[PDB]
């Protein structure tokens, strides 16, 4: 004995024990990236080749 079964309706599982087809089609992708930078440089210079007489004491 079986229950009511429709004619035009598609084959779907309706109770406990019916079968279904599962197509495993998984595709997961993820990524991340980061960066940072810093820089500093300095240079100072002073010279005095020939010193005059009036600045010689200084």
């Amino acid at each position: 004995n079986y229950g009511y079964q429709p004619l035009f309706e598609d084959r779907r599982p309706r109770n406990i024990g019916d079968t279904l087809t599962i197509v495993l089609q998984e595709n997961v992708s993820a990524s991340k990236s980061s960066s940072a930078n810093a820089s500093r440089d300095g240079k100072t210079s002073f010279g005095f080749d020939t010193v005059p007489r009036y600045l010689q004491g200084l």
């Binding site: 004995n1 079986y2 229950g3 009511y4 079964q5």
Partner: protein, 72 residues
């Protein structure tokens, strides 16, 4: 064998409908309605072969075979 083509002109696929009467007994006779499915032209002077008649419970209740009458 499979694969070989078959072109037919005298065969038509049909659906058969019938009404189950109350308090029906085995051996009694009922009338049926024969309707063509597909792309057939006419059912003039045709003959219906054996056909199981099932309800919504997918169990047989009647067997149908006879000659189709078309008014024409």
């Amino acid at each position: 064998p499979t694969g070989t083509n078959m072109q037919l002109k005298n065969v038509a696929a049909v659906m058969v409908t019938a009404s189950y009467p109350p308090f029906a007994r085995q051996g009694q006779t009922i009338d049926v309605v024969v309707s063509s499915m597909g792309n057939a032209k006419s059912l003039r002077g045709g003959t219906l072969l054996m056909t199981p008649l099932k309800g919504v419970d997918s169990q047989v209740y009647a067997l149908a075979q006879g000659n189709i009458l078309v008014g024409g």
